[PDB]
Amino acid sequence: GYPLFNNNVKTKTLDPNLVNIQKKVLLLLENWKQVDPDDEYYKIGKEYNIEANIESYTNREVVTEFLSLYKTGFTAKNQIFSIYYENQALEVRALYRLFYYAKDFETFYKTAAFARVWLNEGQFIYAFYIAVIHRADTRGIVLPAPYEIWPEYFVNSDVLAKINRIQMQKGLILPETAQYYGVLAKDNAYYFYANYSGPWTYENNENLLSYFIEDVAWNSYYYYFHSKLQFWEKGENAIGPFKERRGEIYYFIYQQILARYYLERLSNGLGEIPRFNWNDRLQAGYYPLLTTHQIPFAQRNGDYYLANDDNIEDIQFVDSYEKTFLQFLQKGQFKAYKQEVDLYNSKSVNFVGNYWQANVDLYEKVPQRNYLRSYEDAARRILGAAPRNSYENLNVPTALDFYQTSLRDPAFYQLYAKILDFINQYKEYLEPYTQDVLHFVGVKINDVKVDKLVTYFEYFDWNATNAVYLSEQQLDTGSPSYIVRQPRLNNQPFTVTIDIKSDVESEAVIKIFIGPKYDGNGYPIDLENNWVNLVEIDWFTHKLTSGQNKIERKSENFFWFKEDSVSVSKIYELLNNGQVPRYMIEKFLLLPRRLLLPRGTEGGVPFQFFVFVYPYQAPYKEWEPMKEFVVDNKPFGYPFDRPVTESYYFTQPNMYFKDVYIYQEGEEYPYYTSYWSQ
Amino acid sequence: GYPQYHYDVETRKLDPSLLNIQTKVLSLLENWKQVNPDDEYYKIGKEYNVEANMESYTNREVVTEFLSLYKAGFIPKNEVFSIFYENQALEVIALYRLFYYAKDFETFYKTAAFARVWLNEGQFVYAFYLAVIHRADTRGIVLPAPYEIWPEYFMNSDVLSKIYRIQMQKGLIIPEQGPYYGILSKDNAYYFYANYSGPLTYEDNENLLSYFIEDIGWNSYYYYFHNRFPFWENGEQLIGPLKERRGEIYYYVYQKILARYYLERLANGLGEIPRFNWLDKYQTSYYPLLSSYQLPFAQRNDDYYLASGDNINDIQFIDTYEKTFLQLLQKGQFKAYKQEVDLYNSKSINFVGNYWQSNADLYEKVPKRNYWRSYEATARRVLGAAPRSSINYENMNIPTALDFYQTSLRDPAFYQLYAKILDYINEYKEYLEPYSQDVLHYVGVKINDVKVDKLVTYFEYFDWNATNAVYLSEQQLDTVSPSYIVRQPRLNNKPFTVNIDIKSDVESEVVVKIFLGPKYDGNGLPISLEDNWINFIELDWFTHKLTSGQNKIARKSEEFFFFKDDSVSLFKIYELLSNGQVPSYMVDRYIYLPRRLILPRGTQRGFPLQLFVVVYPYQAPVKEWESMRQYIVDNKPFGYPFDRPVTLPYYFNQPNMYFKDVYVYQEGEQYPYYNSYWSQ
Numbered sequence A: 001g002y003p004l005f006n007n008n009v010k011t012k013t014l015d016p017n018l019v020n021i022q023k024k025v026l027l028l029l030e031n032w033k034q035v036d037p038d039d040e041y042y043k044i045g046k047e048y049n050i051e052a053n054i055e056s057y058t059n060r061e062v063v064t065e066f067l068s069l070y071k072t073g074f075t076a077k078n079q080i081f082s083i084y085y086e087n088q089a090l091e092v093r094a095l096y097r098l099f100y101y102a103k104d105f106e107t108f109y110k111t112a113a114f115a116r117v118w119l120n121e122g123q124f125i126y127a128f129y130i131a132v133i134h135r136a137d138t139r140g141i142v143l144p145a146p147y148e149i150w151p152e153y154f155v156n157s158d159v160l161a162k163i164n165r166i167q168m169q170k171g172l173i174l175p176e177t178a179q180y181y182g183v184l185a186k187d188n189a190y191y192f193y194a195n196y197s198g199p200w201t202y203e204n205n206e207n208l209l210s211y212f213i214e215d216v217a218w219n220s221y222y223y224y225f226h227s228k229l230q231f232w233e234k235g236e237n238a239i240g241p242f243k244e245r246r247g248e249i250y251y252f253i254y255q256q257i258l259a260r261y262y263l264e265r266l267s268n269g270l271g272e273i274p275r276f277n278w279n280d281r282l283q284a285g286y287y288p289l290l291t292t293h294q295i296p297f298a299q300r301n302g303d304y305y306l307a308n309d310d311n312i313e314d315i316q317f318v319d320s321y322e323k324t325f326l327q328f329l330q331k332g333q334f335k336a337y338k339q340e341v342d343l344y345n346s347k348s349v350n351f352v353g354n355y356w357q358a359n360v361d362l363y364e365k366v367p368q369r370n371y372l373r374s375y376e377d378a379a380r381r382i383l384g385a386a387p388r389n390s391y392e393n394l395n396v397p398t399a400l401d402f403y404q405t406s407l408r409d410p411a412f413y414q415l416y417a418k419i420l421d422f423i424n425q426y427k428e429y430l431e432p433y434t435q436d437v438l439h440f441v442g443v444k445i446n447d448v449k450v451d452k453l454v455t456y457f458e459y460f461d462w463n464a465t466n467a468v469y470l471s472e473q474q475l476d477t478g479s480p481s482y483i484v485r486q487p488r489l490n491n492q493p494f495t496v497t498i499d500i501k502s503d504v505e506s507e508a509v510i511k512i513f514i515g516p517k518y519d520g521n522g523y524p525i526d527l528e529n530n531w532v533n534l535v536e537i538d539w540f541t542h543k544l545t546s547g548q549n550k551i552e553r554k555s556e557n558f559f560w561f562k563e564d565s566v567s568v569s570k571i572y573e574l575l576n577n578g579q580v581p582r583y584m585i586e587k588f589l590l591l592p593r594r595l596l597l598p599r600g601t602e603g604g605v606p607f608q609f610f611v612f613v614y615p616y617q618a619p620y621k622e623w624e625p626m627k628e629f630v631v632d633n634k635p636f637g638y639p640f641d642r643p644v645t646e647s648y649y650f651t652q653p654n655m656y657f658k659d660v661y662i663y664q665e666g667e668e669y670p671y672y673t674s675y676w677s678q
Numbered sequence B: 001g002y003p004q005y006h007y008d009v010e011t012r013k014l015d016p017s018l019l020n021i022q023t024k025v026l027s028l029l030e031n032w033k034q035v036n037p038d039d040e041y042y043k044i045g046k047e048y049n050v051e052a053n054m055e056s057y058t059n060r061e062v063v064t065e066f067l068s069l070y071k072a073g074f075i076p077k078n079e080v081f082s083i084f085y086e087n088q089a090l091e092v093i094a095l096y097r098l099f100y101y102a103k104d105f106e107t108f109y110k111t112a113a114f115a116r117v118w119l120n121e122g123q124f125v126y127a128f129y130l131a132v133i134h135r136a137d138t139r140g141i142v143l144p145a146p147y148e149i150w151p152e153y154f155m156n157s158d159v160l161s162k163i164y165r166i167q168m169q170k171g172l173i174i175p176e177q178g179p180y181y182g183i184l185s186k187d188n189a190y191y192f193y194a195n196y197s198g199p200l201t202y203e204d205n206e207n208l209l210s211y212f213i214e215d216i217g218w219n220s221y222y223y224y225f226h227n228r229f230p231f232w233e234n235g236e237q238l239i240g241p242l243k244e245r246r247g248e249i250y251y252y253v254y255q256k257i258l259a260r261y262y263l264e265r266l267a268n269g270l271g272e273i274p275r276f277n278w279l280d281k282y283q284t285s286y287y288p289l290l291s292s293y294q295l296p297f298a299q300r301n302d303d304y305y306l307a308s309g310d311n312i313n314d315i316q317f318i319d320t321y322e323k324t325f326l327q328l329l330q331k332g333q334f335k336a337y338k339q340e341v342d343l344y345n346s347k348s349i350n351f352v353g354n355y356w357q358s359n360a361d362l363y364e365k366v367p368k369r370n371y372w373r374s375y376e377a378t379a380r381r382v383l384g385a386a387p388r389s390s391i392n393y394e395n396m397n398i399p400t401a402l403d404f405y406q407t408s409l410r411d412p413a414f415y416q417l418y419a420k421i422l423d424y425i426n427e428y429k430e431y432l433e434p435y436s437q438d439v440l441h442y443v444g445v446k447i448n449d450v451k452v453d454k455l456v457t458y459f460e461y462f463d464w465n466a467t468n469a470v471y472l473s474e475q476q477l478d479t480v481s482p483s484y485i486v487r488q489p490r491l492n493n494k495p496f497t498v499n500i501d502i503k504s505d506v507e508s509e510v511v512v513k514i515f516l517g518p519k520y521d522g523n524g525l526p527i528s529l530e531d532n533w534i535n536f537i538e539l540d541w542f543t544h545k546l547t548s549g550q551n552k553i554a555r556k557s558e559e560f561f562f563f564k565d566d567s568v569s570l571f572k573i574y575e576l577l578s579n580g581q582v583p584s585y586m587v588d589r590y591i592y593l594p595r596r597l598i599l600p601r602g603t604q605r606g607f608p609l610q611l612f613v614v615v616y617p618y619q620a621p622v623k624e625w626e627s628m629r630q631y632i633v634d635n636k637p638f639g640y641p642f643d644r645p646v647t648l649p650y651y652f653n654q655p656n657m658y659f660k661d662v663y664v665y666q667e668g669e670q671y672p673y674y675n676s677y678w679s680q
Ligand SMILES: *[C@@H]1O[C@H](CO)[C@@H](O[C@@H]2O[C@H](CO)[C@@H](O[C@@H]3O[C@H](CO[C@H]4O[C@H](CO)[C@@H](O)[C@H](O[C@H]5O[C@H](CO)[C@@H](O)[C@H](O)[C@@H]5O)[C@@H]4O)[C@@H](O)[C@H](O[C@H]4O[C@H](CO)[C@@H](O)[C@H](O)[C@@H]4O[C@H]4O[C@H](CO)[C@@H](O)[C@H](O)[C@@H]4O)[C@@H]3O)[C@H](O)[C@H]2NC(C)=O)[C@H](O)[C@H]1NC(C)=O
Pocket: A072, A073, A074, A075, A076, A077
C-alpha cells in the first residue's frame, strides 16, 4: 500500500491570441494511430496539394526534394518507424523540413493534415512533435507528455494486454472479480495497477533499480533532449546562438545522466558501471517485455558475442572510429574535416562532442557527402542483438532504436560511459583551474545545514488511451479512459541554509551539487576521482551585504528541476479558463523534482553536498535570446568541467562539503500492489 | 575510533589431579618454532628411544610402522607442512598414532619431547594438538586458541612485517614516531593495529565482507571441526556411540557454514553464491597477502583455466566422481564399497556424507587399498592454482590457502565448491518423504507471541597474542619473551532476549528450537520456505516444562546452545591456572561458533531477518548415548525439522510454530578501517 499522489498544478495565464492554435494542435494529436473520415482535417488532407502551394514555403529546394522523395513512394501505414532506419529517417527529415519552412500557421496546419491523412502515423507524430517544439509561431504552446503520446513504449506487456482485453470486451464481463487482477472500474474510467520489471527481464540484480531506469519521466527526459537537439539538424536551426557550445551540452547532459545512474547503483549496492571489449562478449542480459504492433522487442542473453559473421564491417568501423580519436590525442593540434583543432584550448570541446555524435555540424565545412556513417548508430545496432537482414521492409525493434526506450537498456549506459571515458582522456589536456580563479577573496562559507532527506513511493496515474484502437461510435461521441496507476519515487520538501561571512558587499553566484561519498568497495572517493560523479542540483545568484548572511533555498526553487506534467483532461479544463500548466511551458526540458534524491534506506544511505560561491558575471549580449537556461558566462558544470588534479589547491574557504543521509519511509520495495496489500 | 573489548570469563575449578598435565602441555607449546637446549624436554627427547620402550605402547604395529618410516627419513626442519602433502600426511599420521596409543601420560610426554627435538615443528605441533584433543587422560585441560599457535595464518603481511621489524630492532629507534604507523609501546608490550584485506585481495566487491571471512574465530572454528573429526581417522576412535551419524555431522556443519556466509552476502548486497563449471574459465580471482617462512601464498589470476593438460587427469577423476553419484541417484538401492545402501531411508545420509568426504569409514568393508584418492583434495589442488611443478616435486611446495584448515575459509572458491557438494546432497535429499502433519502438529500447544529486544551490531577492538610468529634470542628464551599483541576490529552484537508465550492445555516436557534465516534474496523478492529451508541457521535448542495454562519463556542470547564465548589469552590462562581454575567453554564448548558472530552487520545500516520458533514433544536419547549427553538434547536428527526438503509449506502453519520478522541495526562506524592515529 502506497499513498495516492494529489497536487494542484501551478498554472499561468495563456495569451488569448495563441488559444486557437493550442486547440488545433491538440486536435491533431487525438487518436493519431487512426484516421477518422468524419474529422475536419480529413477533407483538408485529402484535398491539399503541396506543389500548387509551393509559393507558401519560404525555401523552394525543400519542396522540390520532398516532392522528389514522394514520387518514389513513402513507407506504408501500420508499420514500425525508427529514426535509425535510413530510408525512414530520410523521409521524415524532408517532412520535418517542410513543416519547419511553412510560411504561416495555416500552411503548417494544412501540411500536417495532409501528412496525417496520407503518411505513416509514426513519422507524422514524430515530425509534428518536433516542429511544434521548434516552430517560432507555436512557441508558448503546451504539448502532451511523451508517455501519453506513446503509451506502449512506457509500459510492460501485461498491463497493455489487460487494457486490450478490456477494450475488446468493451468493459468487464464479471466485474466483481476484476479487482483481484488489478483492474478497477470507477468514475467512468478503468484503472490498471502496474508492476516494474523483475529479475526475469534484468540479470545480475539490476532489477533492484527497475523503478528508476523504467520511470516514465526518466525516459521522457531523454526523449525531450533528443527532440530539442537532434543529431540530424544544424545548430543554427536547433539552438541558435549556442551553436559553438553544442558539444559542451552533449557532454554535460550525458555525464549528468551517467552520474545519476551511478548514484542509483550505489544506493542499490550494484557497484560501478562495467566496461566491455568489442572483440569480447557483452555481459548484460536483457529480455524486454515490450511490443509495438505486437512485434516483440529484441532479446539479448547474458553472454552475447558482439563480433559475429554479419557484423564484421560495423565492428571494423567502430574500432577505427576509436583509434583515430586516440591518434588525435597524440597530435594535439591538427586539421580534421576542414576545421583546425587545437586540443590545448578548452573551446575544442565543441569539436570533440560533435565528433562523438557524428552530427551535421561535424561536416559543415566539407562538400555534401553521399557516404554517411555514425559511430552511435553502429554501436546501437551491434548492441541491440537484433537479427541482421538486408531487406528494408523487415525489422525487429530494439530498445536502442527508440529514444523513448533507450534508457531501459544497460548497454546504453556502458556505451556512453566508454564514450565519456574517451572524452575525459581528451579533457586531461586542459590546464587545471588555479587558486586565483577559485578563491573568493573576502567571502567565507561559515556553515551549511540541510533538513531531513526522505524518499518514498507514491501512486501516480497517467492516461494510456492512445495505445488502443477505438470503434466508430467511440470516435464519434467519446472514448473511455484507460488509466495506468503505478508506484513512483518521490521526496519530501527540504531546505538548504547557507551561513556566509563577507565584509565586502557584492553580487555572487551559488552552485549546489550532490554526489557520492563511498564507492562500491566501501572506501571514500577522493575528489580527484569523484569530480565526474557530482550532479549539479542548484545554480542561482544572490547579493551579499557587509557582515553575516543567511541564505535559505527551498527544494521547490532549484534551477535544474521542474514539476510533474498533467493529463490532457486538466489541460482542457485550464484552457477553458484561459490558463496552461506553467511548468509544461516553463522548464519542460528538465528532470522532474521527484527524482532529485536517490531512494534511501531505513537506516540511511550516505551522500554529500558541495556548495560553491564565486563572483557573478552577466551572460554575454548575443546570448540574450537564451537567457532562461543560463545564469552567467561560466561553462556548464563549472568548476567540475575539467579534471581536478590536486584536491589541496582546489579547496578554498568559499567551498563547503557536507555529509548527509537519505532515509526511506514506508515500503522499501515497489511491488506491493496486490488487492490483498491495499 | 572503536571501543575496547572488556568481558568476564566463565571459570570452573580444575581437577587437582590434572594440575600437572596442563602445565606440561603448556610447556611444550612455548616457542614451538624453536628448540631451546636449556629446557628439560631437550634432554628427555635427545635421550629417549622409541624402540626400547615398545612395551609402553598398546599397539605394536604402530611402533613398527613409525620406526620404518623414520628409518626412511622424515621431512627436514624449517619447511612448510600441510596435511594435503601425501608423504607429510603419512608421516604425521604415523606420529599421531604413536602419540595416541601411549599407555600413560609419561610415555606420551617423552614421545612428544622426542618429536619436538627431532621432527619438523609443524608436524609436531599438529600431532600434539590433535592428541591432546583426543587423548583420554588429557580431557579437561585447556589449549591455546589456534590464532595464538599459528599467528602467521591469521594476519596479513603488513602487520607481520611491522612485528618482524620491531623484533629485529629490539624496540623503536624513534619511539615518538611509532603511533603514526600503528605501533603503540605500552606496559612492556607492543600493540600493532591490524586492518582487514582490501580490494587488492578480493574482487567483485567481496572485500566488504572480509571482516567476516578473515575473522579469527571463523577459521578457528573450522580448524576445531577438522581436529575433532579428521577425515583420515576411523569413526570409532572419533565418535564411539554415535559413529553411524558421522555423515550427518558432515552435512550439518557445512550446511551451516555456507548458510551464515550466504546471510552475510545478503547483508552486503552481494547476492547468491556463484556456480561454476570445471571445464570453463574460473571467474573468481584471489590475491592473498599471506606468507609462511617468507614463501608467498599462491595467487589465482582472474579467468584461470582449470582444464589444462597438466591437470587433465585430476579433472577427469573429479568429473567421474560426480557422474557416479548421479548414477546412484538413478539406482536408488544398490551396493557400493561392499555396503548395501537404500536412498529411500534417511539413515543413508551417513553413507552420502562419507562418500563426499572420502573418509576412512567409506572403505571400512573393503581390503586395505594402496590406491586412494579424495574428491575434496583433488578439487582443492585444482582450485589452488599452484604451479604443477610444486605438486610434482616433493621437496618443494608453494602454499595455498586451501592447503590449510586455518586459512581455507579465506578463499571464496571454498564456498562455491562446498555449495556444489551440498547441491548434490540436496538432490539426494529430494528422495526423502516430507514430514506429515501428525509429526509436526503438537496437539494442545499454541504459541501466542514471540518478542525480541533490539538487535544491534558493532565493531570493537580485540587484542590477541602473536609472540609465536617471531624467532627469539637466547637471552629472551632464558629470561622472558617479548609481548607482541595484535589489536584488530571485530564484529559483535549486544545482548538480547527472546520471550515466548505458550498456552498449554496439559502439563508436559517440551523441546523448543529457535532458528534464524533471511527474508529477501539478492533480487529483492521474498523467499518461500520450499527454497528457504536450507538457509535457516539453528540458534537455540533446549528443553522446558509447561504447566497447564499460560507460560512465558525468557531465553537470553548468552545462553544459546550452539554458541560459545571468546577464548582467553595465554597470560589469562596462566593467571587462572595459578588460582586453580580453567575456562569452561575452552574446555568443552570450543567446537561451537563464537557468540559475537550470531547477527549480520548490514551495509545499509538496517537488515531484515526472520526467526522461527518450534515446540515439540520431548523424548530422552537412547541410553547408549550416555557419554554424549552434553551435546545431544533429544533423539531428533540435527537440523530438525529443517533436515529434509519442504514440499507443502502449509504443513508448517501449525499452532506450535511461529515466524517472526526482525530487523538488525548497526551502531557506530559502519566500516572497520577507521583505526588510524588521527581517527583515534
Ligand atoms: C506476404 O509477403 C509478401 C512478400 O513481401 C507480401 O507481398 C508484398 O505486399 C506488399 C504490400 O501489399 C507489396 O507492396 C506493394 O506493391 C504494389 C505493387 O507495385 C508494383 O507496381 C508498381 C508500379 O505500379 C512498382 O513500383 C512496384 O515495384 C517497383 O517499384 C518499387 C518502388 O519502390 C521498387 O522498389 C521495385 O523494385 C519496383 O521497381 C511493383 O512492381 C505497390 O503498388 C504498392 O505501393 C503503394 O504502397 C506503397 C507503400 O509504401 C507506396 O510507397 C506506393 O507509392 C504505393 O502507394 C499506395 O500506398 C497506399 C496503399 O498502401 C495508398 O495510399 C494507395 O493505395 C497508394 O496507391 C506496395 O508497394 C509488395 O510488392 C508485395 N511483394 C511481392 C508480391 O513480392 C504480402 O503482402 C504478404 N502478405 C501478408 C498478408 O502479409
